[PDB]
Design a protein around this ligand. Structure first.
Ligand SMILES: *OC1(*)(*)[C@@](*)([O])[C@](*)(O(*)(*)(*)P(*)(=O)(O(*)*)O(*)[C](*)[C@@](*)([C]O(*)[C@@](*)(=O*)[C@@](*)(*)[C](*)[C](*)[C][C][C](*)[C](*)[C](*)[C](*)[C](*)[C])O[C@@](*)(=O)[C]C(*)(*)(*)[C]C(*)(*)(*)[C@@](*)(*)[C][C](*)[C](*)[C][C@@](*)(*)[C](*)*)C(*)(*)(*)(O*)[C@](*)([O])C1(*)(*)OP(*)([O])([O])=O
Ligand SMILES: O=C(O)c1ccc(-c2nc(C(=O)c3c(Cl)cccc3C3CC3)n3cccnc23)cc1O
Ligand SMILES: O=C(O)c1ccc(-c2nc(C(=O)c3c(Cl)cccc3C3CC3)n3cccnc23)cc1O
Lengths: 309, 297, 309, 297
C-alpha cells in the first residue's frame, strides 16, 4: 500500500523478552547464587504482582459497580469478571492467602501484615499518582486490536455528513412549512437493537406518514403521532442512519461482529453523539436524541419528549 | 438519555485507592514499625516497579523501532517517548531512588521477572481497562469510517461495478480509491493533477466517474478513479475547531483507516479483483502513481 | 421442554472444588504443619503437572506433526499451539528449568535427574497404558461444548436421506438412458470452500448441461465434459447438498460459525462420508467422491476420475 | 481423496511414549539408583495420580448428579460410572497401592492441589485433544441434524408461515414440531393418536398440514402439527445394522438435538413467537400433550 502506512504490531516485544530472559538466566548462572533464591524471588514476585492486580481490580470494581445496569446487565458476575479476571481463580488464591496468613507461627505474622500493608499502600499510590499510565504505544495497541471500535467514527461521520448540514436550515424549513400549511425540532430515534425499518409505520401503527419537507436530496419526513387515535402533536422523526451500519455489520458474518458488540457500540455511539452535539454550534435547541430498547410503544416514547418542548 | 446508556467513567477508582490508603496507613500506625523503615521500603518498591516499567518499555522498543518511519516520522525520540508512559514521573521516581542510595544479582532477577511478565502476558489489560482506553475521547474514528464505507457505498457498488464496466467498452476493471494521507480531496480530480480529466459517468443513485490518464498529452490508460468519501470527515474534523482534532491525529487516523479498509477488503466477498487502494502522500504526480497500478495488470 | 432433556452442564464441579479447597485448607490449618511445606508442595505439584502436560503435548506433537498440511496449513506454530498451549510460555519455563538443572550444586543433581526421569516414565506409562482416559461425562462435555460439530450429522443425514435411496436404482437409470439415447456412476463434488452455485456451468465453462435422468422428484442431471472443446466423456455430476448448509451456516452471522470452522468441518464431513460409504451396502462401485480446493480447472479434476473407470 | 483432507489420527503418540520410555529407562540404568526405590516411587506416583483422578471424579459427581434423571435414567450407578473413566484400571492401580502399604497431612495436600486443578482449569484439554474426541466415531449427529433442519426446512418456512396462516382463517399461529424421543414417527399423524386427523394443507414446494385436535369427539383446537424430519435419520441409523447405532445412543442424540434446536431457535430471527417444540416420551395421549401448549396462548 504505502511504506508510511503502519503495519499491524507484531511480537517484537516477545522476542526482546526472550532475549532478556536468556541474558538474565546466563548472568544468574554466572553469578553462582543458589537456584533456590531465584525460585523464591520468582514465586514472591508473581504472588506480589497478582495481589497488586487484585487490589487494582478491587479499586476499579469500586467504580465499575456503578455501571452495573448500563454495562453488565445488572449481574455482578460479569462486572467482577471484567475487572479482575476469573473470580473463581481469584477467590481460590484469596482463600489460600487467608490460610497462609492464619497459619504463621506468630513470629512472622506482624512482619507479613507490614509487608501486605506496604503493598496495598504502593498500589494505592500507583492508582492515585497515576504511575500506572499507559504509554501511547500501548494505547495505540489497544485501540488497534480489532476493527470494532466504530462508535466514535460513526458518530463523527454522522455529525459532519448529515447533521452539520441539516440542522442549520431545518428551522427555516419547518417555519416555511408551518406558514404554508408545530413539528418543531429534529428527532433522531436511537434503537439500541439497531433495528431500522424502511419506514416508521410498520414499526409503530400510531406513527403514520403525513408529508415531506421542502428542500442534495435531504429527504426529511414529517410524522404525526396519534394518542388513542387523537393526534397529540406532530414532529419530524428520523432514524439514526449509522445504526444501520452496526446492524449490517453483525449480519455480515465474516467480521465476527456479535450482537453483544452491536449493543455495546450502539450504546457508545449513543453517548458519543450526544457529547458531540452538546457543544456543536448548530445543535442548541435544534435536535433531540431518543434512545429506547425493545423489552413498549414507540409513540409514547416520542410523545414524552414533545411535552417538555 | 436512557438508563442503559453507560455514563462516562468517573473517579471511583481514586476514591477506592484513597480508602485503601487510609486503611493501610492506619495499619502501619497500628503495628508500630518505625516510619523510616516503612518509607525506605516504599521507595525501594516504587523504584523497582519503575525500573521494571523501564525494562518493559525497552522491550517494547523492539516492536516500536520497526515502525520508526511509518509511525514516528523517522525520529528515535518519538519512538522512545511512545514506549515510556510518563517520562517526568518516572524521572522523578528514579531521581528519588538515586537519592536514597550482591547488587548485580537483583538487577538480573528483576529483569528475569519482567521478561516473564511480557512472555506469559501477566500485564494484559482487563476488559474494564481495555474499554476505558477505547472511550478516552472521540477520535478513534478510523474503524467506524472504514466500516461505514464498506457496509455503505462499497458493498453496494463493487459487485455491480464489473457489470457496468462490461457494458461500456461496447477502461480498467477495478474500482480505484485514492487515499491521500493529507485528507485533502477537491470537488473533482482536475485540480488534483492536470493529467486527469473527466470523461463520462457510469449508469440508490450511484455516481461513478471515468477518468482517462495520459502522459505528455498522450492517452495511456483509463479507469474509474474516485476519492475516498470518509476522508472528508477526517479533514472536516480538523477544520472543526471545537473538536481539537489536530493534523497529526488526522494523519494517524487516515493511515489506520487506510490499513483497516484493506483488511476488510482482503476477506470481503465483493472485493475479489474488483477494488484497488492507492495510498499516497505528497513529499509528485498523481497520474504516474495511479498509472503504476494500471500497468500492474 | 421436557424434564428428560438434559440441561447444559453448569459449574457444579467448580462448587465441589471450592468446598474441597475449603475443607482441605481447614484440615491443614488444624494439623498445624508449617505453611512453608504447603506452599512448597503446591509449587512442586504445579511444576510437575505442567512438565507432565509438556511431555504429553510433545508425545501428541510427535503424531500431530504428521497432519501438518491437512490440519495446520503446513505451519509448525499452530501445530505446537494446538498440542501444548502457548509455545512462548512453554519455552520460557523450559529455559527456566534448564537454568535450574545446570545451577544445582552437584549434591542435588543426580537426584533431580532421577526425579525427572521418573516423571517421564510415569507420563509414558500414562500414555501407553491409557490411564489418561476421559470419562464419558467429560467426553460428553467436549462433544456438547458448542453446536458446531455438524460433520457427522451432515454426513449421516446425507447418506440416509439421499444416497441410500438414489444409488440402488441409479445404475438402472443410467442403463435405461444409455439404451434409449457411458455416464457411469454418480459423482459428488466436494468443494472444501463449500461454494455451491445454482448450476454447474457458471462454475466451469467446460461443464454444460446435457440432459436430465428418468425418475420423490430426485432430480439428477447428466453433465458432459469438454477437453479442449472435444467431449472427453460424460458423467452424472452432483454437488454435495450438505455443503450448502455449512456455507449458509457461516453467512448466518449469529451462530459465530467462522470460515476456518467452515473448512474444518467440510474436511471432517469429507472424510466421514467416505467412511460411511466404504462399508455401505449400496455404494460399492456405485459412486465417487471428488474433493477439491480453490487456489485449477474443475473439468480436469472430474476428468481425472473418469480415466480410472 | 485430497491431500488437505485430514486422515484419522494414528498411534504416533504411543510411539513417542515408547521413545520416552526407552530414554527414561536408559537414564535410570545410567544413574545407578537401586531398582526397588525407583519402582516404589513409581507406584507411589501412580497411586497419587489415580487418587487425584478419583477426587476429580467425585467433584464431577456434583455436576453429574443434577442430571441423574435426565442423563442416567435415575440410576446412581450410571452417574458414578460416567464420572470415573476406567473403573477396572483405576481399581487395579489402587489395589497395587494398597498392596504396597503424618499420613492425613498428605491426603489434604493432595486434595488441595486437585481442588486448584479444577478451579484454575489446569486439566483443560488442548485443541488437539478436544478435536480428537470430537472425531472418535461418527455418532455425534445431533449438532449437524439440528443445523440442517434450521438452515434448511425451518429457516425458509417460519417467516412465511404466519402469512399462509393469515390467509386461511378468511388455527394456531405457531408451527408445532413434535419430537418423540423414541424417534418413531409414522407417515402421517393418524396412527400417532386417534384424536388427530388430517384437515387440509397450506399453499421449493413446501407441504404443511393442518391437524385439528379434539377431546371426546369434540373439537378443541387446530394447529400446524408436523414431525421433526431429522428424527428419521436417527431412527434409520439404528435400523442400519452396519453402523452400530444403538437405542441408547439414538436416544442420547435425540435429546441433545432437541436441546440444540432450542438454542438455535432461541437466538434465531425467524422463530419469534412462530415455532413451538413439543418434546415427549411414552412411559399417554399425544393430543393432550399438544393441547397443553395450545392453551398456553
Ligand atoms: O496456568 C497458566 C495460568 O496461570 C495463566 O493464567 P494467569 O492469569 O497468567 O496467572 C498467572 C499465574 C502465574 O503465572 C503463570 O502462569 C506461570 C508462572 C509460574 C508462577 C509460579 C507460582 C506463582 C505463585 C503462586 C503460588 C501457588 O499466577 C499465579 O501466580 C498463580 C499460580 C497458579 C497458576 C499457574 C500455576 C503454575 C505454577 C508453576 C510453578 C512454578 C493462563 O491461564 C495460562 O494459560 C496457563 O493456563 P493453561 O490453561 O495454559 O495451562
Ligand atoms: O494468581 C492469582 O490471581 C493470585 C491472586 C492473589 C494472590 C495473593 N497472594 C497473597 C500473599 O499473601 C502471598 C502468598 Cl499466598 C505467597 C507468596 C507471596 C505473597 C505476598 C507477596 C504478596 N495474597 C494475600 C491477600 C490476597 N491475595 C493474595 C496470589 C495469586 O497468585
Ligand atoms: O507453566 C508451564 O507451562 C511449565 C512448563 C514446564 C515446566 C518444567 N518444570 C521443570 C522442573 O524441573 C521444575 C522446576 Cl523449574 C521448579 C519446581 C519443580 C520442577 C520439576 C518437578 C518437575 N521442568 C524441567 C524440564 C522441562 N520443563 C520443566 C514448569 C512449568 O510451570
Amino acid at each position: 500500500l504505502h511504506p508510511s502506512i503502519p503495519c499491524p504490531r507484531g511480537h517484537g516485544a516477545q522476542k526482546a523478552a526472550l532475549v532478556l530472559l536468556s541474558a538474565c538466566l546466563v548472568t544468574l548462572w554466572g553469578l553462582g547464587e543458589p537456584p533456590e533464591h531465584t525460585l523464591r524471588y520468582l514465586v514472591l514476585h508473581l504472588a506480589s504482582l497478582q495481589l497488586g492486580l487484585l487490589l487494582n481490580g478491587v479499586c476499579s470494581l469500586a467504580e465499575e459497580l456503578r455501571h452495573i445496569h448500563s454495562r453488565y446487565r445488572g449481574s455482578y458476575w460479569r462486572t467482577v469478571r471484567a475487572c479482575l479476571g476469573c473470580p473463581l481463580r481469584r477467590g481460590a488464591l484469596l482463600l489460600l492467602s487467608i490460610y497462609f496468613y492464619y497459619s504463621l507461627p506468630n513470629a512472622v505474622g506482624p512482619p507479613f501484615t507490614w509487608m501486605l500493608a506496604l503493598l496495598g499502600l504502593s498500589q494505592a499510590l500507583n492508582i492515585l499518582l497515576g504511575l500506572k499510565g499507559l504509554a501511547p504505544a500501548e494505547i495505540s495497541a489497544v485501540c488497534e486490536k480489532g476493527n470494532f471500535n466504530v462508535a466514535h467514527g460513526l458518530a463523527w461521520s454522522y455529525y459532519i455528513g448529515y447533521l452539520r448540514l441539516i440542522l442549520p436550515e431545518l428551522q427555516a424549513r419547518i417555519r416555511t412549512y408551518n406558514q404554508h400549511y408545530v413539528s418543531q425540532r429534529l428527532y433522531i430515534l436511537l434503537p439500541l437493537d439497531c433495528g431500522v425499518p424502511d419506514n416508521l409505520s410498520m414499526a409503530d401503527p400510531n406513527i403514520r406518514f403525513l408529508d415531506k419537507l421542502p428542500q442534495r436530496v435531504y429527504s426529511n419526513s414529517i410524522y404525526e403521532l396519534l394518542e388513542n387515535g387523537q393526534r397529540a402533536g406532530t414532529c419530524v422523526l428520523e432514524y439514526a442512519t449509522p445504526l444501520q451500519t452496526l446492524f449490517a455489520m453483525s449480519q455480515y458474518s465474516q467480521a465476527g461482529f456479535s450482537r453483544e458488540d452491536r449493543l455495546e457500540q450502539a450504546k457508545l455511539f449513543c453517548r458519543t453523539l450526544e457529547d458531540i452535539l452538546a457543544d456543536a454550534p448548530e445543535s442548541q435547541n435544534n435536535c433531540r436524541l431518543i434512545a429506547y430498547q425493545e423489552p413498549f410503544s414507540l409513540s409514547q416514547e416520542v410523545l414524552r419528549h414533545l411535552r417538555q418542548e
